[PDB]
């Protein structure tokens, strides 16, 4: 079954996290977690659907990334038997430095997070799914109605994976988010730190 195979993938990531996300002891991997989530919101911006991305560092050391795009698709594709979103989130770099890392997908971020929450606003409805190291708590479900559209991912990195540098560095995220808004001109990126009230808005016209 997909369940056993999904778990086998998630377990591969957790056993050699460095290989997938980058170094787990110097902050490379930790901050790369944010950038992987951001990258898919950037693709949605570049295709002309999302105008703003908001990255928030919370006081409990989680990070959320939200966009105003179309929302990750929610329907169940006949081949997989669960939402397309859950497939994206769950189905599947050691010595790389900073911008030399290659992209590995948000299912890696999910595997290496103690908790992750996905909230999709799409087709008139608010949809929610929660994960613990990639394992959904329940099927993606409808929790309300909305005229808005977009996707939000919030994740709590696992301290079973990350050591030494365990708390996000505002300056690392600021530097790279600014570079990303330069490298993908037109897209507005905001960074908010709830620990100390700092905010920035990066946008090149
Ligand atoms: C907070 C992070 N934002 C998104 O992931 N936005 C996003 C992703 C989409 C993906 C997607 C998500 C993750 N990985 C991949 C490869 C695609 C597929 C299709 C649509 C319409 C999306 C819309 N918004």
UniProtKB/Swiss-Prot annotation:
Subcellular location per the Swiss-Prot or TrEMBL entry: Cytoplasm
Domain of life: Bacteria
Record function comment: A type II topoisomerase that negatively supercoils closed circular double-stranded (ds) DNA in an ATP-dependent manner to modulate DNA topology and maintain chromosomes in an underwound state. Negative supercoiling favors strand separation, and DNA replication, transcription, recombination and repair, all of which involve strand separation. Also able to catalyze the interconversion of other topological isomers of dsDNA rings, including catenanes and knotted rings. Type II topoisomerases break and join 2 DNA strands simultaneously in an ATP-dependent manner.
Family: Belongs to the type II topoisomerase GyrB family.
Other notes: Few gyrases are as efficient as E.coli at forming negative supercoils. Not all organisms have 2 type II topoisomerases; in organisms with a single type II topoisomerase this enzyme also has to decatenate newly replicated chromosomes.
Description of how the protein assembles with itself and partners: Heterotetramer, composed of two GyrA and two GyrB chains. In the heterotetramer, GyrA contains the active site tyrosine that forms a transient covalent intermediate with DNA, while GyrB binds cofactors and catalyzes ATP hydrolysis.
Protein name: DNA gyrase subunit B
Organism: Escherichia coli O157:H7
């Amino acid at each position: 079954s997909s369940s056993i195979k999904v778990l086998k993938g998630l377990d591969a990531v957790r056993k050699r996290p460095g290989m997938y996300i980058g170094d787990t002891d110097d902050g490379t991997g930790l901050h790369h977690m944010v950038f992987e989530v951001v990258d898919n919101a950037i693709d949605e911006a570049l295709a002309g659907h999302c105008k703003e991305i908001i990255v928030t560092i919370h006081a409990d050391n989680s990070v959320s990334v939200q966009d105003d795009g179309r929302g990750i698709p929610t329907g169940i594709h006949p081949e997989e038997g669960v939402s397309a979103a859950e497939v994206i989130m769950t189905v599947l770099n050691s010595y790389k430095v900073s911008g030399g890392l290659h992209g590995v997908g948000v299912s890696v971020v999910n595997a290496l997070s103690q908790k992750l929450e996905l909230v999709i606003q799409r087709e008139g409805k608010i949809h929610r799914q929660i994960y613990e190291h990639g394992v959904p708590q329940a099927p993606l479900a409808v929790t309300g109605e909305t005229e808005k559209t977009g996707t939000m991912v919030r994740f709590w990195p696992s301290l079973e994976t990350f050591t030494n540098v365990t708390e996000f560095e505002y300056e690392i995220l600021a530097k790279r988010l600014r570079e990303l808004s330069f490298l993908n001109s037109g897209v507005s990126i905001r960074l908010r730190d709830k620990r100390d009230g700092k905010e920035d808005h990066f946008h090149y016209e």
